[PDB]
Amino acid sequence: MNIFEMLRIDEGLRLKIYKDTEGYYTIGIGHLLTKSPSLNAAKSELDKAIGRNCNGVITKDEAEKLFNQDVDAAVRGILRNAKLKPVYDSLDAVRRCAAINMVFQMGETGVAGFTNSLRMLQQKRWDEAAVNLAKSRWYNQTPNRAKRVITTFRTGTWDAYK
Numbered sequence: 001m002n003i004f005e006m007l008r009i010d011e012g013l014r015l016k017i018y019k020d021t022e023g024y025y026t027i028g029i030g031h032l033l034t035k036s037p038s039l040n041a042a043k044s045e046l047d048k049a050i051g052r053n054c055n056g057v058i059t060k061d062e063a064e065k066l067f068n069q070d071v072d073a074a075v076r077g078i079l080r081n082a083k084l085k086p087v088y089d090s091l092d093a094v095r096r097c098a099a100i101n102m103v104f105q106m107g108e109t110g111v112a113g114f115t116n117s118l119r120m121l122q123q124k125r126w127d128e129a130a131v132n133l134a135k136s137r138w139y140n141q142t143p144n145r146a147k148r149v150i151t152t153f154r155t156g157t158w159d160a161y162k
């Protein structure tokens with residue numbers, strides 16, 4: 001297991017424009033296109049992202065390339081953020097995957113606001129961090145995915161994904 005396999009499980013793969021759990025137009029392995037209600041706006045974002053006129057449909061290779069870009073962007077956002085980087089650098093490799101997963105789903109600004117959870121994680125207070133992480137809109141709205149991520153932070157294993 002690695003961050004790509006973990007997020008591929010959590011996000012799935014769809015080659016045509018779909019809606020995420022919040023109702024926003026998305027494609028591929030969880031690539032957000034726009035928060036606008038306009039499908040045309042989403043299609044315009046897609047064509048810009050891929051570099052051709054896609055008509056709302058991409059190939060598996062294109063989905064995987066977008067996914068690589070999106071994972072890298074999440075990592076870069078962690079490493080550029082003064083609140084996230086010290087916590088990330090304190091974690092082992094498996095827990096770093098859980099951190100990237102959260103930033104992929106909610107963005108660096110949103111995750112950087114999880115101030116108390118971040119402190120507990122940096123202190124390696126795993127059970128307390130897990131309890132605190134579940135006291136969130138994130139957990140209530142996507143509980144099965146949040147439970148897998150939280151279990152990864154709690155245990156430092158891939159048990160929730162096996």
Ligand SMILES: C=CCOc1ccccc1F
Pocket residue numbers: 078084085087088091098099100102103111114117118121
């Ligand atoms: C608040 C939970 C997410 O945890 C992290 C996210 C990004 C970087 C480091 C982390 F520990």
